[PDB]
Design a protein around this ligand. Structure first.
Ligand SMILES: Nc1nc2c(ncn2[C@@H]2O[C@H](COP(=O)(O)OP(=O)(O)OP(=O)(O)O)[C@@H](O)[C@H]2O)c(=O)[nH]1
Ligand code: NA
Ligand code: NA
Length: 422
């Protein structure tokens, strides 16, 4: 026993993303998400299912909680995707009132559910649990505020366990006008309590789906969220399947987090299709991951990499993975203080993702974070300097002074990344 992870999905986006993640995990372990059983004994591969799956005598269940302050997103998802016996009622922590896109309402209202959540966790969590993943968007009220509260709560209640966030930033034009306040409040909270924050945004996800997968239409968020699920599954693949070089959650965080504050990470994956996986080299895939076309956060350029983690999955030539390292260091811009021999952390797993020959996943700690975050700050200031939209934050326990305090800490983080850039 050991290595187990518990996944908390918070708000509409966090729970919708959870569908794609759990679908991917079940497929990788040849588990039928509808029957809760192995699809077959003969195709049961050597693996470690306990990382994300609880095996009970009746079948497999996700080590997850599905948390929201309104019931519609989760209930509709479970009905449409036929998840009733996998996303079961005993794993749901739902209320009725909603956060109304205000971080402060999500935070305050979520406090009422913390006892129930902690009881569910302490009911079924093994003592050898390595950590928690919190999946949430930053621009709404529940994912942002309740997700922030949960990050704080888990770090306090479970010392020595990793707390990692997979967090969706607002789009280039925000689709929630309150998103700057919610994003600054969330990033401030995660800077204080998360061990590592892996970021995504829908502008980048849409670009990848339209340009790398060439989907003719995106009709549901599943046709975007699958990319987030791919990152989550691939970066944990070496905990779950054999390979030459495995790595756990805090192993990856320790290699990325150069200074305590530099914990905000941009992911990328290559390739995106089976056909590309069968007609590519390790060098080609790594170069794609380091190219802004493949970043899952919308960036103006390659920035400067401080530190990176690369997971190689599938039919990988180890000599190519190693031999290309000097090429990565020569062709990709790293921050000025990074020694020519440093800034890379490798994992290598023999299991390829569904039907692919091979795949590379990159987690990059990149100074371009400062540009992404500066844009959030500029949006925040445009509202705050006019006192726009502050009333419902104030009424839910976030004073205007508190809003400014969060903004100023956010700016301190931006400046640390900018200083490292040079
Ligand atoms: N990628 C992705 N983004 C989502 C998804 N659902 C919502 N979003 C984004 O999340 C932000 C809105 O937050 P939601 O997750 O809907 O809000 P919530 O966390 O449920 O908070 P409240 O509705 O205020 O209670 C917007 O920027 C949306 O574009 C999703 O399934 N996938
Ligand atoms: Na919602
Ligand atoms: Na909503």
């Amino acid at each position: 026993p050991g290595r187990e992870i518990l996944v908390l999905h918070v708000g509409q986006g966090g729970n919708q993303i959870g569908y794609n993640f759990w679908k991917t995990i079940c497929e990788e372990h040849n588990i039928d998400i509808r029957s809760n059983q192995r699809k077959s004994v003969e195709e049961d591969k050597v693996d470690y299912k306990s990382v994300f799956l609880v095996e009970a005598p009746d079948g497999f269940h996700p080590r997850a909680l599905f948390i929201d302050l309104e019931p519609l997103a989760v209930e509709f998802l479970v009905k449409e995707m036929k998840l009733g016996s996998f996303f079961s009622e005993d794993l749901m922590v739902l209320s009725y009132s909603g956060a109304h896109n205000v971080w402060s309402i999500g935070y305050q209202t979520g406090k009422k559910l913390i006892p129930v959540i902690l009881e569910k966790i302490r009911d079924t969590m093994p003592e050898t649990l390595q950590g928690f993943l919190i999946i949430h968007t930053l621009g709404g009220g529940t994912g942002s505020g309740f997700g922030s509260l949960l990050t704080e709560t888990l770090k306090k209640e479970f010392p020595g366990k990793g707390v990692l966030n997979f967090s969706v930033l607002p789009s280039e034009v925000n689709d929630v006008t309150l998103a700057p306040y919610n994003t600054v409040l969330s990033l401030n909270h995660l800077s204080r309590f998360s061990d590592l924050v892996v970021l995504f945004d829908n502008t980048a996800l849409i670009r990848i789906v339209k340009d790398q997968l060439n989907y003719p239409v995106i009709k549901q968020f599943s046709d975007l969220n699958f990319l987030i699920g791919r990152v989550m599954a691939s970066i944990t693949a070496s905990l779950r399947f054999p390979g030459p070089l495995n790595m756990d959650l805090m192993e990856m965080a320790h290699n990325l987090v150069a200074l305590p504050e530099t914990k905000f990470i941009i992911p990328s994956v290559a390739p995106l299709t089976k056909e590309e996986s069968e007609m590519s080299t390790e060098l080609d895939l790594v170069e794609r991951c380091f190219d802004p076309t493949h970043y899952m956060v919308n960036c103006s350029g390659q920035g400067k990499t401080i530190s990176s983690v690369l997971m190689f999955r599938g039919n990988i030539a180890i000599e190519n993975a190693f031999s290309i390292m000097t090429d990565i260091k020569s062709n990709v811009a790293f921050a000025p203080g990074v020694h020519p021999d440093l800034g890379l952390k490798y994992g290598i797993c023999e299991s390829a993702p569904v039907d692919f020959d091979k795949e590379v996943t990159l987690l990059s700690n990149n100074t371009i974070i400062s540009e992404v975050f500066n844009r959030v700050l500029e949006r925040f200031d445009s509202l705050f300097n006019r006192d726009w939209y502050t009333s419902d934050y104030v009424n839910a326990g976030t004073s205007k002074s508190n809003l400014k305090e969060a903004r100023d800490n956010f700016d301190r983080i931006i400046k640390i990344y900018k200083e490292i850039e040079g």
